Amino acid sequence: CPLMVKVLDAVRGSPAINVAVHVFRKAADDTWEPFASGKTSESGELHGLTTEEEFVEGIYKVEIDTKSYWKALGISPFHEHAEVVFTANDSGPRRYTIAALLSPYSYSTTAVVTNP
Amino acid sequence: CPLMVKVLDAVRGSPAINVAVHVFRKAADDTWEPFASGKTSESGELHGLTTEEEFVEGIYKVEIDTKSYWKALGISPFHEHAEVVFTANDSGPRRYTIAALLSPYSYSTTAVVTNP
Amino acid sequence: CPLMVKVLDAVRGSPAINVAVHVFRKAADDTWEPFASGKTSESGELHGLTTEEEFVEGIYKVEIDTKSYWKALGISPFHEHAEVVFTANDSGPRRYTIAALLSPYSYSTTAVVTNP
Amino acid sequence: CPLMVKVLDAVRGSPAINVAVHVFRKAADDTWEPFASGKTSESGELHGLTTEEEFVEGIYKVEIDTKSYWKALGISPFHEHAEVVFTANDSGPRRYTIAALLSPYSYSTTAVVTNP
């Protein structure tokens, strides 16, 4: 499972559950082609987005629907989404964990990359 | 000066100097129209991006060229760039400061929205 | 396992392995009494610090030896350690996950708290 | 003004105003000796903590009373306070800005060390 996303809520001190995540891959014409998407689980994790074979080298964008999350809590959000844009697999397959920590007016993200 | 961007380096504990920043406004056709751009100063700040008359409500994207910053320092980066996507809403305060804290595999961003 | 600590490295994009973590509990005389300690595993996680019975209500301080971590990489660190000070279990047992993200001149921390 | 502290609120997207900040210097007996303190201004900043003549090399602790900030706003906080523990070293730049970004269950802190 070479791409995993984990999302946490800094207001409530919890996983961010049922958060939509879209992944895009930059196409030859410089547009963002849909690649994979899903929603975080009760643990704030989203597994099963892709497979080693599907996950070719390229520039990927992970877009996390932070706005819907805050609106369902009735808290005013600043951002439309949180983004994570990176080149993947250009030296062969790697496993990427993208973590995001959400506040209404801030987010932080980090990547953990391992070589299988 | 309703929009300011500030960028900091968490590896060296310094302003992030000469970082390219591009701002886009979402057009009616859902494309991103160039809006403003510049390079951070010696203080890590980019002032004078826009004026009150130009900065209307809407969805804006700030792209910060973090990869070029790191690669010139001889430190391997993860991201292509950092993004900040938000709605500018005339309700509430009128000056937006977008801050970004950079690490090779992580970033944090916050918005500070104030009157004077 | 009611107290877990996870530590990530924002420079290398990895778990922070073999990081020392000390936990203290504020004593009646306002000094910090040693409570539990350990080192993060290959996954950056430290489990097994305490048990429900040992982990009474009180004010706890988690001190993460960030300085040794950076010095073993030959990277100059700013902080002596990273701290996380909080009241625990004052409404009965809870499970606390303390996450920390380390850069040489910055750290971020968040807590996930669940009710067993 | 060799030491400045800046505090931001990630829930409301604002400076964190009237936040108590205490600075301590580690004494020879390993106790923390009061060194400087104050409250953040309307801009979230605390200037004038010390002078060049007073701020000698050594280990310093900055304690930021985050709990009092949140509890007065009617938002439940996790931490008792935030801490920043660091060595002041006269090698390298001479002005230290300690920034803290607050959320109820999280904080981020960075140091920016500059000359003018």
Numbering used by the authors:
A (entry chain A), B (entry chain B), C (entry chain A), D (entry chain B): 10 to 125
The publication says:
Some of these crystals grew in conditions that require the addition of cryoprotectants when processed by standard manual methods. However, in all cases tested the automated laser mounting and direct cryocooling after liquid removal with the CrystalDirect robot produced samples with very good diffraction properties leading to high-quality structural models.
Here, a series of new methods are presented based on the use of a low X-ray-background film as a crystallization support and a photoablation laser that enable the automation of major operations required for the preparation of crystals for X-ray diffraction experiments. We have previously shown that the transfer of crystals to X-ray data-collection pins can be automated through the so-called CrystalDirect approach, which relies on the use of a thin, low X-ray-background film as a crystallization support from which crystals are recovered by excising the film with a laser beam and attaching it to an X-ray data-collection pin.
